[PDB]
Structures are given as C-alpha cells and as structure tokens.
Amino acid sequence: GNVYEDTHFFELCDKYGIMVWQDFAMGCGNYSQRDNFAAALEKEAISVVVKLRNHPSLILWSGPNNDRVSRQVLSRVIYEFDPTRPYLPSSGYYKDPFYTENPSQFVSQIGYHGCPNRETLERMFSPDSVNPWQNGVVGMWNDEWQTKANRIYDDKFQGGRNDLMTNQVRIIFGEVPADLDDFIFASQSVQAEAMKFFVELWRGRRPYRTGIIWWNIRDGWPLLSDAISDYWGGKKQAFYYMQNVHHDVCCLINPAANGYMLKVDNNTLKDFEGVVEVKDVASGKQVFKGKFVSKANQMSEIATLPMQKGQGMLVISYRIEGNEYFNHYLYGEPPYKLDQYRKWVKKCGIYE
Amino acid sequence: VSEQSLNGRWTLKFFPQPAVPVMTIEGAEAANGIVVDAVVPGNVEIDMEAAGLVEDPMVGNNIYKLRPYEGYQWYYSRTFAAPVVTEGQRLVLHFGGIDTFAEVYVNGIKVGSADNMLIEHDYDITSVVKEGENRLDVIIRSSVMEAQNHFLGTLSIGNFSNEESAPVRRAPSTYGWDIMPRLVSAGLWRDVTLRVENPVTIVDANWVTLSVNPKAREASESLYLQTRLPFEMHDKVKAVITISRDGRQILRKEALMRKFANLFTLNLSGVDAWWPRGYGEPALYTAEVSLVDVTSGKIYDTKTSKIGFRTVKLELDEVNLPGQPGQFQFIINGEPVFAKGTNWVPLDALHSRDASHVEEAVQLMVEMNCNIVRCWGGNVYEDTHFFELCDKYGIMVWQDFAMGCGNYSQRDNFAAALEKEAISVVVKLRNHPSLILWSGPNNDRVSRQVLSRVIYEFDPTRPYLPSSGYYKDPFYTENPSQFVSQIGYHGCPNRETLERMFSPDSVNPWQNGVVGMWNDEWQTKANRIYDDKFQGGRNDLMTNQVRIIFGEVPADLDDFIFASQSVQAEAMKFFVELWRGRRPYRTGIIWWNIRDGWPLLSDAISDYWGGKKQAFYYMQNVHHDVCCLINPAANGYMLKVDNNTLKDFEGVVEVKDVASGKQVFKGKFVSKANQMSEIATLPMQKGQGMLVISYRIEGNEYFNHYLYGEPPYKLDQYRKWVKKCGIYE
C-alpha cells in the first residue's frame, strides 16, 4: 500500500544488516487483466527492479491463481531482470487458539491496538477532545477520536475500529479506566503483552516456525493505530517489550501442557553459555536457576517450570558473557487487576 | 436526458465496390450508383425489393440472384435535428448494429469506423454536431472483399465455416450453412438513436445474486455501480436503489455518492427465487438505481432492469469420463436441474427482421415447455428483448460466442478484436437471470485465453465452457454423454409452406416424376450455398429415413409429407424419452431445432412461417413437467415416469394396445420429485403395433404413445394407429 522507498532507505538497510522484503505497489483486491494495465505495470516493475536489484538488503519480491498481474507480468520482469532473488505471488485474547494455532511457519502478525503516549494526544487533538469519552460517557468516542481511527469519509457514526481499544482493555483488566492516564497505560500494556507473547510464541516454536513480521513499528500520521510508536516518535509500552524479546539470544517462557517451558532462542551462528534465574515478582520465590547452553541458530529447551498459583508475573534474569539481560512472563488467566499489574511491572524493575 | 430515434426513411445509394474501396463522402457521391429509399433498421435487400429491383429470395432459386451484391458498397445518408445539449452534457450517436465495415460521418467529419456487426457502436458527436439540420452518412464496404486483407492460417481453411468468415467479426451462418442460406447482406439492421447524457450519469449497473434461500424467501444481491461523476458533484449526489415487484416496493436504499464506483449489498427478505420452467416460478423483481441531487432533487440518470435472484453452478463429472463433453449438470439454486430445450438458430437470414419474430419464436419454446435454449454460435447475439422474454418465462439461456466450425487466428489482431466483442457482449447481458453459461487443440488462444479472461474479469458468476439412419441405432442409444446435443431428424414441411416457397411447377419434389430425383428448386431449399448443379446429398436424408421406417417412398406428395413428418416425429420423441428415462446419469438434452430462419427443407420441427410439423406436437407431449413414457428394455419394455419439478405427484397410468384395445397395464404410480421413477416392466407384444399411455395427475388427463415392433412399418397402418389413438391428427 506504500510507495517504493528511495535509494537511501536501502542504503541504511544495507549498512545496518536489515533484510528488505519488497512488495509491488498492489492493494487489497483483484486488478485488470487487460493489456493497458499490464503494460503500465510492466514499465513500473522493470523500472523499480533495475533501480533496486543491487542492494544486498533486498531479498525478495512479492506480488485466483490465474491473475495475469501476479502470475505473468511481475514474474516475467523478475525472470529477465533479477534472476538472483525469489519472487512470491502473494497478492480478543492474544492467547486465543486463533493466534496460538496458526499453521504458518512464516507469520505476518496482525498486531494489537494501543493508545499513544499522552503527549501525542494533546498534540493531535483539540483541548476539548483530548479526553476520549464524549460527554464523559464511558463507551462513546467523540468525533475527533473517531477521525483519528481513520474514518476515510466524514460519515458520522459510532463504533467500529475504536471499539478494538476498549475491548482489549476489558478482556485483560476487566473494566475500562475512566482516568485518561490509567487508560493509556492499560491499553499500552495490553498491546505490550500481546505483541511480546506473539514473538515469544514463534521464537519458542522453532525450527518449524521460520519467521515473524509484525504490524508495525511506526505510524505515518498522528493516529490511533496498532503501531508501537507514533508519527512523532513516541515509543509506546509495546516498543520496549518487543525490544527485550528481539535479542540475538533471548530467554523466554512459553505456556506448556502442564505448566510452563523455560527456553532460550538463538538467532546467531555462535554458541553461548549463561545462567538464567526465574523468580516470582510479589513473593520473590526463586522458581528456577541453572546454567544453559544456547546452541547456535536454534531454540533450546532449558527446563519445565512448575505451574504457579493464581495470577502473578515471573522475572527472567539471564547473564551472557558478563551482560545482564532481562525478561518477564505474565502467568494466570485474565481479567487482571490494573493496579496489581502496575505493581508487578514496578517491582520487576525492567520497564517504567 | 432523452433518446431521440433516428429510425425511419434514409437514402441508400449502392454501387459495385471499385479496386480501392470508397471511404469518403466525396467518393461515395462521385461513384456511379443507384439511389433508392431505405428503412432503418433494415437490410439492403429489403430496400431493393421494395424498389422492385430484386425478386423475393424466399421463393425458388431467387436466393442466388443476390450474388453480385456481395461485392457492392452501401451508402446510407439522412439528415437529423440536433437535440438540445447544455454544458457538460454529451451527445452520443448510438448504433445497435452496423453490418459491417463502415465509416460514419457526421457533418462531413468522420466520427467512427465500424468492423463488428454483432456489437453496438457508440460515438461522441458532441463536438461535431451543429445547430439546426445535421447530416449523418454511413459508407459500408464489401464484407466478403474485406477477408482478402488477411492471411489465413492453415487450420482456418477447409472448415465448414466459410473462409471469408474466419478473419471478420460477423455471423458465420450468413456466408452459408446447411441450415441457413448464404446471404451476406449489409445495412443498419438495428436501431440508430441519439442519446444525451448528463455530466452525472450511470456507466454500468451490474446486479449479482450472491446467495439465495428459496425456503426462507431470502436473497443477498450485489449492485456493482460505476458512474461518471464530476468531482464538484462528489458528496452532493446520492444513489437511490429500489427493489419492487408488481408495484409493491420491497426495498429502498439511499447512499451518498462519495466515489464514482461502489459496491452495494442488499440482504433481502420475503423475496422469491428465479426458477426455470418446471422447477418453480420465474420470479422477477424490478431493480432501479438513480443518481439524485441531494439539494435540488434533480434526477441525473436512472437505470432500470428486471432481475432474478438465482445462482448457477456447473457440476462437472469426475468419474464417468471426467473432462469429456457432456459430463456436467447445471445446479440452479442448489438443485440439480434436468435441461430440456432447443438450439437457437438465426430467426431470419435478413437479421433486421429478427426482432419481429422473437415474440412468436419464444412462444414456441413456451408451448414446447423448454427450460433451456442454446443460442448457436453461427448466429448473431440476440438483443435485450429476447433475454427479457427468457427471464419472464423461465427459459435458461446457453450463450455461444459467435464462433463457427473451424480453428481461428492465434495472433494479436484477432484476439484484440474478439476481446472487444466479448467484453461488450458480456457487460450487456450479464444481468439477465436466464443466462446461465458462456461457451467458446487445447491450446486455442481464442477459447482458452481471450474469451476465458473476459469471463474471469467481467462475469465471475457464470461458468464458461470452451467447447469450440434408424433412430434406434446404437449410434444414438449408446451415447455416453450425460448432456446431449441431439442431431435432429429431417422432416418435410407442411404442404402450405411448399406451395409458398416453390414455383407451381416445382411444388412436387420429383423431377420428371422420377422417384429418387429432386428438381433444381428442392435442391436449392436443401441449402446449396453456391449454384453448383448436382444431384443427391442432403436431400437424400429425407427419402432414406422414410424408406427405413416405411419401406418405400410414397409417390403422392401428401403421403410423403405425412410420412417424412412422422419419421421426424417418432425419432425426435424417442430421443427425448430415451434421455429422460435414463436419469439421473443423463443430465440434459438440447435438440436441433424448434424453428427455421428461412423457408427451407431442414431438420427443424417448425418452419419459418410458423408451420408446426408433426414432430412439434410429439415433442410437446414428452416435454411435460411429469411425463409417463415407455423405453425399450432387455426383455420387453419399461414403463416409467420422469419428474422435472421439485414437487411429488401421484397418479394413475394405463397402457393399452391401439388395434386390439387390450389393456397392457394399469396402476397407481408415485412420481418422486426431480427424478425418474420406474413404474412397471411391460411384457413384450407380438409383431408391430402401437401402445397408448393414458395417465391422470391432479384431475388432468395427459397422453402419450409408444411404437413397438421393428421397421419397416406400413404407412397406411401407422396412419390408422395414430388416428385410432386420438392423441394427434
């Protein structure tokens, strides 16, 4: 749905070792099968392929099985002008079996909504519209928050995409906080735990799972979206959660049949040794502590942790080569108590 | 805003085409030709017969006397008052049919060049029209000579379709077939009108039935609406959708036009589904969409059409010959329907008279109780009214693309000309519920690419099929196809037709009284495309069939007409009964054919002038929704009843011999819905004869018969059997 980024974007991806999966500018829906559209698209594909085919970061081109666009026009361009890269004609509880039973090895995670940082709300909303509740009614959004939910045409209605925010907060924390700052932290915490769970769930299911690309790191406009950082650079709570589960060597906990499985995932070509410690936040009881060997380019099971009582949150402290890395795991079933969850994150000392 | 008609009296100037064809007005007026009055819509041959320049081609060998005119040019000309156009309005000159290669001039300015007689042609004459009297000139050149502008591939030469037909977009049967005479003709054979379009106008209103629930009387209908909308009119115009039936409004939905193209879905309640004949009612609903100004209330455009909530699916067989022709069944509204109907040939060799025959011709299928009709690819595409009657009377339409017997060009020029034709015909007809299928060695770009891509993009709701003398012979009785296209049997027309299309001295078929020889006129009415004098061929199909069934050929004319018609009547009746009685494996039967397009000696069951042959009445009695028939069996005969409806029926059937009157069988039967049921195995009768099948359902007496024994039969005895039976005359 986006334009083709210019040369400098690929230069930074080349410099910082970030592989690029490039879609052709095609949106949701089927397109024309006639000569005029094919010729206009062939001219575009040939131009963009010759311009970008020299960047090492670029690794793939991407475009019912009779679509001339994806199965002919775009494929012929790649066949003649870039035979070195593959071409792929591809055209509310986060622990629901809808997510946890995805059969795809390479997943495009849908992402979870999250209210931006308060500074962004006061910058893109009118002073009277900073508070989301119209006339103070908990359940209703004003006309401005509905606009920042992407209402393409000014059709006055109530509900829709904006309900995705309060629904997620209600599933995890029971009720929707009336206070604005209590709502921002709650909605950001839901997005933070949900997105962290997806990355940990796919890293922990290797070698069958081969990749995960989530929606998304940054917004292109001051909006209420499922991105983890806004247009003005405001990193949401999810950004920091994802950062700790994106490490080259990450110790994480996955749900198991009769408890939890402590594991370590290696996204490098080198082996590593370390020591991991698992403790409960509130009680401080050490659940597990021992040495692990993280073999290269694979995930390794460390130990099966016994099931804990009720709700709570665990602390995963692991040291590799004299560097202390940290992670956590929220155990129990929702709804959780927002003040109690805030106490767990505070006592843990990983985030703020 | 308005549609002014340009039909009526035109000026027609015709002349032989020179070596360099005439393309301009100056050359057309400079050419030495004849000027006569012409009627639009019309054919040039009609205008010359009105001028007393050609004899009636429907009589004797007069058809051959039109040969020199295939190399003539035709100059239509008329004046017209320009309609009032305001700023932003567009003036469109509309042709329903130009046959064929013509240059269209308006006030001496060329506005278009036509090269396809089967599709409409619209030209924007807004910038060339003048205030007051305007001039409209159409210069047609020779279609036959146009073929020599192409180099034919090897596979395009030697087929039954004329070589002249291969590189041009015309009806292949106009060049000559076995059922239709050669009559290339020319002219403006459909309406010519002037249309005024507002800046806000409807480009296309595509109605699509997504799903239907006949029991709950529900249906999900989609409207794909494309419009022309100036941006100053965005958010200022609204679409008003209206579904109604018999005056009662079923739904009225309004929506603000924020884009030029939108999809509207309507979940309807209390709406009946469209069913083919026998399987229910052909429920039609009036679907209207209008673009209305939100402030002024001005109606900028309105598109109205009668639609039907119906789903069609082509279930293909995967065991008994998977992939072979005929191994499929139509699934209408989820139910497997059994198709019974006729092939649709040209209604008239002069196709401007087609519209004047549609009503009578469609009524033949209604009396015949056809639930399907295949429009043959050798014919033109029928106009909107034909599909309207098929929508109204519940007759499903199988539409061929205008492709004849033989392989066609694989190059870009023919593909582009055919793609333009297919896109035009699909958008025009895709809203009719009666239309159920499109139809086009497995590497033909035409059938496996061009036509299939059009259906894929512009009509994803209908299937597309790339399909390009004793009647009891195992050739017919051992056909493996579930869906059969029956070949049909020849039958001499009713005597009144012979005396109307033959010369008085040529009414009798025997030349010099010799039984075995046909005169030169009967050979002409056997479709002899070119005047090559020979003896034999297609005409022998008549006397051969009479000889197989009745032994000898009757010398008397009326004895021959009744005999040849009886052979066609029994043969065609046997085919329908044989396929209805072999369900559920057999899934349909489409026979050749219900009506002729020219006074000819053909295998049709009714002639061009409406004369129903004996076969028409025989077929009528075996086309009933519930029909009791007798099929041959291994050790006797099998009395059975076939149900082409969705309802069960009870009745009583009686089987008796004609001559003896002995009751062979009598008992009650239960005809379960949408299937054939065996009633009883009848014992074999002695020698020749004929049985009477009398069955009553719901207080209505229906009748049928079965001719048992082996031929040859005695014509006077067979006439006695039909007379004593009291079913026919």
Residue-by-residue DSSP string for B322-390:
TTSTT-EEEEETTEEPPEEEEEE--S-SSGGGSTTTHHHHHHHHHHHT-SEEEE-TTSPPP-HHHHHHH
The one-letter amino acid code at B322 reads: P
SS3 assignment, position B666: strand
> B384-392 vs B358-368: helix axis angle to the nearest 10?
30
Q: Please report the sign of the dihedral spanned by the C-alpha atoms of residue B297, residue B298, residue B301, residue B307.
A: positive
Nearest to B561 by CA among B727, B717, B715: B715
Cα–Cα distance for residue pair B572/B49, rounded to 1 Å = 38
Cα angle for residues A5, A6, A8 (degrees, 5° grid): 115
A31, A37, A153, A156: best mutation site toward chain B, by most B Cβ within 10 Å? A153
Task: Report how far apart, in Å, the C-alpha atoms of B414 and of each of B109, B144, B335, B446, B457 are.
Answer: 28, 17, 39, 9, 20
Token digits of residue A317:
């402290």
Cα–Cα distance for residue pair A302/A253, rounded to 1 Å = 10
SS3 assignment, position B152: coil
Cα–Cα distance for residue pair B542/A252, rounded to 1 Å = 90
Helix (H) or strand (E) holding B239: strand B237-245
Helix (H) or strand (E) holding A15: helix A7-15
SS3 assignment, position A81: helix
Helix (H) or strand (E) holding B113: strand B109-115
Q: Which residues of B touch A73 (CB under 8 A)?
A: none
Cα–Cα distance for residue pair B699/B408, rounded to 1 Å = 56
Cα–Cα distance for residue pair B312/B334, rounded to 1 Å = 8
| Number of residues written out for chain B | 729
> B614-621 vs B557-580: helix axis angle to the nearest 10?
20
* DSSP label at residue B69: G
Work out the minimum CA distance from A226 to partner chain B, whole angstroms: 27
Token digits of residue B267:
């979940």
Cα–Cα distance for residue pair B355/B706, rounded to 1 Å = 39
Q: How far is CA B242 from the centre of its chain?
A: 31
The one-letter amino acid code at B693 reads: I
* Residue B101 contacts residue B115 (beta carbons within 8 Å): yes
* Residue B597 contacts residue B642 (beta carbons within 8 Å): no
Cα–Cα distance for residue pair B464/B445, rounded to 1 Å = 15
Say how many C-beta atoms besides its own lie within 10 A of residue A244's C-beta: 19
Q: Which residues contact A323 (CB under 8 A, 6 or more apart)?
A: none
Say how many C-beta atoms besides its own lie within 10 A of residue A166's C-beta: 21
SS3 assignment, position B404: coil
Strands B121-124 and B109-115, sheet pairing: unpaired
* Residue B706 contacts residue B728 (beta carbons within 8 Å): no
Q: Which residues contact A140 (CB under 8 A, 6 or more apart)?
A: A133, A134, A158
Nearest to B193 by CA among B245, B117, B146, B136: B136
Cα–Cα distance for residue pair B402/B553, rounded to 1 Å = 39
* Residue B186 contacts residue B99 (beta carbons within 8 Å): yes
B587 CB burial (10 A radius; 0-12, 13-18, 19+): buried
Q: Which residues of A touch B456 (CB under 8 A)?
A: 33, 66
Token pair 């370590």: residue: A264
Say how many C-beta atoms besides its own lie within 10 A of residue B308's C-beta: 25
Could you tell me which chain B residue has the CA closest to the CA of A68?
A: B453
Q: What are phi and psi of A184, to 5 degrees?
A: -60, -45
Token pair 């009055």: residue: B37
Q: Which residues contact B688 (CB under 8 A, 6 or more apart)?
A: B708, B709, B710, B713, B717
* Residue B377 contacts residue B400 (beta carbons within 8 Å): yes
Token pair 């004369």: residue: B611
Q: Which residues contact B46 (CB under 8 A, 6 or more apart)?
A: B39, B350, B352, B353
CB contact under 8 A, B456 and A66: yes
Strand order in the sheet with A299-305: A249-256, A259-266, A299-305
Q: Which residues contact A43 (CB under 8 A, 6 or more apart)?
A: none
Helices (H), B131-210: 143-146
Cα–Cα distance for residue pair B485/B376, rounded to 1 Å = 11
* Residue A187 contacts residue A113 (beta carbons within 8 Å): yes
Cα–Cα distance for residue pair A294/A250, rounded to 1 Å = 9
* Residue B437 contacts residue B465 (beta carbons within 8 Å): yes
SS3 assignment, position A160: coil
Q: Which residues contact A324 (CB under 8 A, 6 or more apart)?
A: A317, A318
CB contact under 8 A, B453 and A32: no
Nearest to A199 by CA among A253, A251, A262, A242: A242
SS3 assignment, position A120: helix
Cα–Cα distance for residue pair B604/B607, rounded to 1 Å = 7
B413, B456, B458, B459: best mutation site toward chain A, by most A Cβ within 10 Å? B456
Nearest to B472 by CA among B211, B153, B207, B711: B711
Cα–Cα distance for residue pair B273/B216, rounded to 1 Å = 10
Q: Is B385's Cβ below 8 Å from some Cβ in A?
A: no
Strand order in the sheet with B689-697: B663-671, B649-657, B689-697, B700-708
* DSSP label at residue B597: S
Cα–Cα distance for residue pair B22/B103, rounded to 1 Å = 9
Q: Which residues contact B722 (CB under 8 A, 6 or more apart)?
A: B566, B690, B728
* DSSP label at residue A277: E
Token digits of residue B53:
């320049």
Work out the minimum CA distance from B113 to partner chain A, whole angstroms: 22
Among B258, B416, B453, the residue with its CB nearest the CB of A33 is B453
Q: If you count DSSP H runs as helices and E runs as strands, how many of each does chain A have, helices first? A: 11, 12
Task: Report how far apart, in Å, the C-alpha atoms of A108 and of each of A215, A216, A317, B376, B660 are.
Answer: 8, 10, 29, 51, 83
Cα–Cα distance for residue pair B62/B48, rounded to 1 Å = 14
Token pair 């599933």: residue: A171
Q: Which residues of B touch A66 (CB under 8 A)?
A: 456
Q: What are phi and psi of B700, to 5 degrees?
A: -120, 125
- The torsion angle over the Cα atoms of residues B71, B54, B354 and B576, rounded to 10 degrees, is -100
Say how many C-beta atoms besides its own lie within 10 A of residue B263's C-beta: 10
* Residue A287 contacts residue A305 (beta carbons within 8 Å): yes
First to last CA, chain A: 35
Cα angle for residues B45, B51, B57 (degrees, 5° grid): 40
Say how many C-beta atoms besides its own lie within 10 A of residue B483's C-beta: 20
Nearest to B135 by CA among B101, B85, B93, B86: B93
Question: Could you tell me which residues are beta bridge partners of residue B567?
Answer: none
Strands B464-465 and B435-439, sheet pairing: parallel
CB contact under 8 A, B457 and A32: yes
Token digits of residue B206:
């595509």
Half-sphere exposure of B685 (CA within 13 A, CB side): 25
* DSSP label at residue B285: E
Omega cis (within 30) before B230: no
* Residue B97 contacts residue B117 (beta carbons within 8 Å): yes
Q: How far is CA B235 from the centre of its chain?
A: 44
* Residue B120 contacts residue B97 (beta carbons within 8 Å): yes
Token digits of residue B142:
């020779």
Among B258, B419, B456, the residue with its CB nearest the CB of A153 is B258
* DSSP label at residue B725: H
Cα–Cα distance for residue pair A267/A195, rounded to 1 Å = 19
Helix (H) or strand (E) holding A170: helix A163-173
CB contact under 8 A, B453 and A68: yes
Phi-psi region of A27 (alpha: psi -120 to 50; beta: other; left: phi over 0): beta
HEC string of B499-567? HHHCCHHHCCCEHHHCCCCECHHHHHCCCCCCCCCCCCCCCHHHHHHHHHHHCCCCCCHHHHHHHHHHH
* Residue B393 contacts residue B92 (beta carbons within 8 Å): no
Q: Which residues of A touch B261 (CB under 8 A)?
A: none
Q: Is B585's Cβ below 8 Å from some Cβ in A?
A: no
Question: What letters, b where the CB count within 10 A reaches 16 and e where it falls short, cover B618-636?
Answer: bbbbbbbbbbbbbbbeeee
Token digits of residue A213:
């690309």
Q: Which residues contact B229 (CB under 8 A, 6 or more apart)?
A: B200, B237, B257, B259, B260, B291
Work out the minimum CA distance from B689 to partner chain A, whole angstroms: 59
Cα–Cα distance for residue pair A160/A146, rounded to 1 Å = 9
Work out the minimum CA distance from A108 to partner chain B, whole angstroms: 29
First to last CA, chain B: 56
Task: Report how far apart, in Å, the C-alpha atoms of A151 and of each of A125, A156, A160, A162, B76 are.
Answer: 15, 9, 10, 10, 57
Q: Is B236's Cβ below 8 Å from some Cβ in A?
A: no
* Residue A320 contacts residue A266 (beta carbons within 8 Å): no
SS3 assignment, position B142: coil
DSSP3 helix / strand / coil % (chain A, rounded to 5): 35, 25, 45
CB contact under 8 A, A68 and B419: no
Strands B396-400 and B372-375, sheet pairing: parallel
> What one-character-per-residue DSSP string does A16-66 give?
TT--EEEE-S--SS----SHHHHHHHHHHHHHHHHHHTT-TTEEEEE--TT
Q: Is A39's Cβ below 8 Å from some Cβ in B?
A: no
Q: Is B456's Cβ below 8 Å from some Cβ in A?
A: yes
The one-letter amino acid code at B415 reads: A
Cα–Cα distance for residue pair B296/B292, rounded to 1 Å = 8
* Residue A187 contacts residue A165 (beta carbons within 8 Å): yes
